[PDB]
């Protein structure tokens, strides 16, 4: 249809406005004095809500142009809470600040691309000090300290964590399900964690940590690529009577196919989501028959001549329960017998020893870590049911924190580590004066989260902000306590994983968004 | 319905405008340096491209005069993409150019038929002075060296190209599909490629390419048109059950047949493609025959007295794929047997000893060397699907450049080729002063391109054209670098083919609209 | 529904105001440096022509008053491509010249129906002055020259279509049909053509020509008027089984018959035309029986004892290829013997030797000629099904010019012919002042056309038009070359006929209009 066409400033001024609403009501949550966010609903009572994240997703604009400007970074500072766990919101005030400042020196005539180049250089400088003042977080002592951090000064969880990563490994893959009574369990079960995401949003029924979540669902196995509800039909008729869910594994779901999915499961008909099978070419098929193996299921394959018309209910394969993120798809406890998992390790443990070539044995023993390490399964005791569900939420939140703690260590929280990472750069220069002003735009633009912080709290941003630069090392200020001194040993921490995918993605968006010159939108 | 007519300058200003919606819209992202368009998308985030061939496709306007402008230049731009697989952004910016100076004579009172000779000499002598300009690419180093930069500076993907060429010849066909494992497949197999499209779109299960791609097809040869789905019933039933999608070559699908066949493939029933047969008469029977022999089906005729009707499953031919572009169709390992088609291949090879005329001995040798050669097949490796996918793209890109190159040789890029030849062309002139000053307005428009590569990296357009018209042969500007010299030692060329593309389609869209009258479209 | 009335003034000037958008829309293509219409088209990229006819059809507009203008001048000037093959673009510029100035002598004062009076005496005086201008085209040598100049001086056509012409005379049946490749077949088959028109629209098949077009039909032969689908379904499920179209033959066909016709090949099934038949009386059976000896075919009479429902296939005749105008009907080799054919042909040629009357005579030996002279084809040859297309339609072009041409002639062309003829009348006068003024106007308007050309070119029309009226004779004015000389030898010329019927039909609808008091039309 007719388009509107926007360019330059025109184009500029809408997005930053855009991302302004955006920025301006998610950044109010911020502090530990966040305040709230309400957030209407047509049936019942409004929502009240100080997760920056909520109110994000609630975040669409009238204004065409404003609206894909709110879009993009909504779209962009998502992957951080996506990658480490938290600090989209994070990732959205960051990229309000460098949007702001950078389109502002664009408009008083430099060079976008050189701005852009100036941004991305003082980010690159800003994580390489922030894996400087990284603390790393690897004996279990520690472990157990940043999951109680992240658990809300909870020590149980702390616990709890450490034990699942006593057991299978730093390395390892946990989940953690409703308890059973009022005692914690932990146990190892069949189960396995490969990459592949949700081949579409809306497949989410769980949107607090993001993901789809289904229980004892039947699982469909094919390779071949699915575009038709023609193959599908008496699989969707069969699985409506049994009554429970589907999960869909191919070479891929396309059009027709996981629209009319994405409208059946919208409207209450058979439930159903859909992922990718991982790898290509002959590991892509291999893998499948490692979850045909785990799921007790079959493959469907044109190349041994069976089609998805000829599928019943045997065919398919099933599991008690299946998680599947933005980026990732992890198995719990399939149907598949203990003797088909314990021969499929034989074989491709037996196909392990004849690599002439380091890939080969690296991909296989990747295969048979996943399949024979299983999963580590978390059941979390409450008491009163209430207590289950919201104990079992801060130990979600509590395993993501300590695994990116595992992977890249902590920092000081309260965006202190930005502020203190970006007053060790001051003499970074770059090519030409149009970079060297995207570096102190970034720069700038790292003292956004702490400055909100503070301003939530009621206290004066340039003050504090001044006296934390003033410091070194981990050394900030504590918003909750209103005390200065380590941000580590008060236990005001973050990961150091969200707080440089943060910046990252933050930065990331910005360039683009700074580089922008046409905009094009459908007419009002 | 009732129209809306304009005439005169009241027209040539509504053109106007529409092409500046268009070709400022899609310059911006022309060059190294190029800006991010963002396109908005109905559900989800916005798109962010620097690709303008993407932006041009949503270019479409409120006003259906100023749309009318936009929609021409669009489609004949188009068709220099089609012709040399690049340059359609260049061809927008040029016409663009043309027009708007064109347009400026035009009012000021001169000739529009003898501007448009003008324009159009001066593109003839462009032609040339690019033939001339041109460095030949025939030696396989150098077809390495292009498809080289054509991949982003992978030797790999020059390397393999090459030796592409070296199996099936610089005139043989190549395909390029996904890879079974890590590195790099080369497989010469029986198959043919022809020329004839789509009947029609909506075919496309690629948009991304735009072309259609069915694996292990059935395919009917029948030699006939076809305006009826009546016939088609039987064959097109016998087929649904096998579950392999239908290739349809005859002389032609009209009407009632056509609309049924998009519709119900549409739908997801049956799902088929239908082509023109290549050529006419005798020798378009005669091919449908080497086709048959080749895929191991049988033509049907209405002359040997078999009807669309009685046709069976065996009747059809097969192959693992086909592809099918707006111009052509290409046929991937065709199941017939070496003895049929070796068989084939003699007769053929004997008709052309007993060739009265030239012209027949061309024809068949055309038919054998179709026959004969086969189709080359590149598969490409990567250590992960995504780089695998994207070292597709780039091969697949890398392949149009480097047959382009092949044929007409490769010039300066960058912009400069087509500003150094029309340094070359300042004596030029025509019958009188009207004339006169088209050579003059095309010869300008040829410094578009190269204007706006330097205005995108923030370069003074002026400046860096003049220096660049001082030089000779292949000296001039790289923008990535801000560094004159040599630009085919300095890596930055494109084959002749699309330089040549572009100019001659600009100036036949330009010449167009400059001699345009009147425009009539539907009413608001 | 109520009306909208205008009267006297008020119409006249909606009038004139359609036909200016109408004429000054189409006039814009005239003469060789005729500029380019833009035709919006709804779903894809516009049409962009020189075609006058292509871009008269679309013109409608909004107001209906100005409506019925445009729409008038529009039907009656398609008549004049209707019979000569050319003209409704010189019609329609000569009808807004002479509507114009009527008009503004109508408002002036004059007698509208003596100004009417005043055009068609100088119209006639312009005729006679045409048929003395004309140089005849009798010679083979003359209708080569004659085809070539219409071919866009290609002298294979010239050469074929005096082929042609010299095998089945210039009075004779000619087709051109696609050729089977590189080389123009010509053959003379049995058939016949005949003043029959379709009995219906929507028989028709190849709507840019606007005919039926069926591919080895049967072809049944009755006598009688048939209102019902009833009698004639056996032979109709008899002729659906074979799978080939059908032709009717009958006195006519009415009601619930005709109308079940329309929507039975409208809908595809069974594909069947229906006949005139030629004439009334015996005229219409006695010829019949010459269609039966010529398409192997039985007469059914009800007159003889034979039913439709006793018909069968055999009883059926058969054909390679009828073609249906709005007026006319030609029969393409039917199978009937030789010796069928050289007897009926004894019959009626010795029938005419009985003959008691003149009239007798003639319409018999109109029978004789039609089946004993019988049909030439054209199959035209090229390299490419393009270069054939684009040939076949020239070589169509041509033989309707060269046909014209043969009856009446030929005359300076490129506008030149009516301005000497009007300018051998400048002392033609009428019975009072009025029909003088409406000599004059007719007069003036005769040079519309040149003028017309002359300021597509660029130049002075008053001045070019000064100059040619100064000589005598075919001496014109050359506008492609701007050369002044002899307009025949120079190889630019029209058919007497298609000057003729533009100047005959352009005043015919001008006469209409300048005496027209009322107008009436719906209400928006």
Same mark, same amino acid.
């Given at each position: 249809a007719a388009k509107d066409v926007k360019f330059g400033n025109d184009a500029r001024v809408k997005m930053l406005r855009g991302v302004n609403v955006l920025a301006d009501a998610v950044k109010v949550t911020l502090g530990p004095k966040g305040r709230n966010v309400v957030l209407d609903k047509s049936f019942g009572a409004p929502t009240i809500t100080k997760d920056g994240v909520s109110v994000a997703r609630e975040i669409e604009l009238e204004d065409k142009f404003e609206n894909m400007g709110a879009q993009m970074v909504k779209e962009v500072a998502s992957k951080?809470?996506?990658?480490?766990?938290?600090?989209?919101?994070?990732?959205?005030?960051?990229?309000?600040?460098?949007?702001?400042?950078?389109?502002?020196?664009?408009?008083?005539?430099?060079?976008?691309?050189?701005?852009?180049r100036g941004i991305d250089k003082a980010v690159t400088a800003a994580v390489e000090e922030l894996k400087a003042l990284s603390v790393p977080c690897s004996d279990s002592k520690a472990i157990a300290q940043v999951g109680t951090i992240s658990a809300n000064s909870d020590e149980t969880v702390g616990k709890l964590i450490a034990e699942a990563m006593d057991k299978v490994g730093k390395e390892g893959v946990i989940t953690v399900e409703d308890g059973t009574g009022l005692q914690d369990e932990l146990d190892v079960v069949e189960g396995m964690q490969f990459d592949a995401g949700y081949l579409s949003p809306y497949f989410i029924n769980k949107p607090e940590t993001g993901a789809v979540e289904l229980e004892s669902p039947f699982i469909l196995l094919a390779d071949k690529k699915i575009s038709n509800i023609r193959e599908m039909l008496p699989v969707l008729e069969a699985v409506a009577k049994a009554g429970k869910p589907l999960l869909i594994i191919a070479e891929d779901v396309e059009g027709e196919a996981l629209a009319t999915l994405v409208v059946n499961t919208m409207r209450g008909i058979v439930k159903v989501a859909a992922v990718k099978a991982p790898g290509f070419g002959d590991r892509r098929k291999a893998m499948l028959q490692d979850i045909a193996t785990l799921t007790g299921g079959t493959v469907i394959s044109e190349e041994i001549g069976m089609e998805l018309e000829k599928a019943t209910l045997e065919d398919l394969g099933q599991a008690k329960r299946v998680v599947i993120n933005k980026d990732t798809t992890t198995i719990i406890d399939g149907v598949g017998e203990e003797a088909a998992i314990q021969g499929r390790v034989a074989q491709i443990r037996q196909q392990i020893e004849e690599a002439t070539s380091d890939y080969d044995r690296e991909k296989l023993q990747e295969r048979v870590a996943k399949l024979a390490g299983g999963v580590a399964v978390i059941k979390v005791g409450a008491a009163t049911e209430v207590e289950m569900k919201e104990k079992k939420a801060r130990v979600e939140d509590a395993l993501h924190a300590t695994r990116a703690a595992v992977e890249e260590g902590v920092v000081a929280g309260g965006g202190v580590a930005l502020i203190r990472v970006a007053s060790k750069l001051a003499d970074l220069r770059g090519q030409n004066e149009d970079q060297n002003v995207g570096i102190k735009v970034a720069l700038r633009a790292m003292e956004a989260p702490l400055r909100q912080i503070v301003l939530n709290c009621g206290e004066e941003p340039s003050v504090v902000a001044n006296t934390v630069k003033g410091g070194d090392?981990?050394?900030?200020?504590?918003? &909750?306590?209103?005390?200065? $001194?380590? !941000? =580590?040993?008060?236990?005001?921490?973050?990961?150091?994983?969200?707080?440089?995918?943060?910046?990252?993605? &933050?930065?990331?968006?910005? $360039?683009? !968004? =700074?580089?922008?010159?046409?905009?094009?939108?459908?007419?009002?």
């Open positions: 951080a809470n996506a990658a480490a766990g938290d600090g989209t919101t994070t990732a959205t005030v960051l990229a309000q600040a460098i949007i702001t400042e950078g389109l502002k020196a664009v408009a008083a005539g430099m060079n976008p691309m050189d701005l852009k090392g981990n050394y900030g200020y504590n918003a &909750a306590t209103e005390e200065y $001194g380590n !941000m =580590i040993d008060m236990g005001i921490l973050d990961p150091t994983k969200v707080t440089r995918s943060a910046l990252q993605y &933050a930065a990331s968006v910005a $360039g683009l !968004m =700074i580089t922008t010159e046409c905009m094009v939108t459908d007419l009002p």
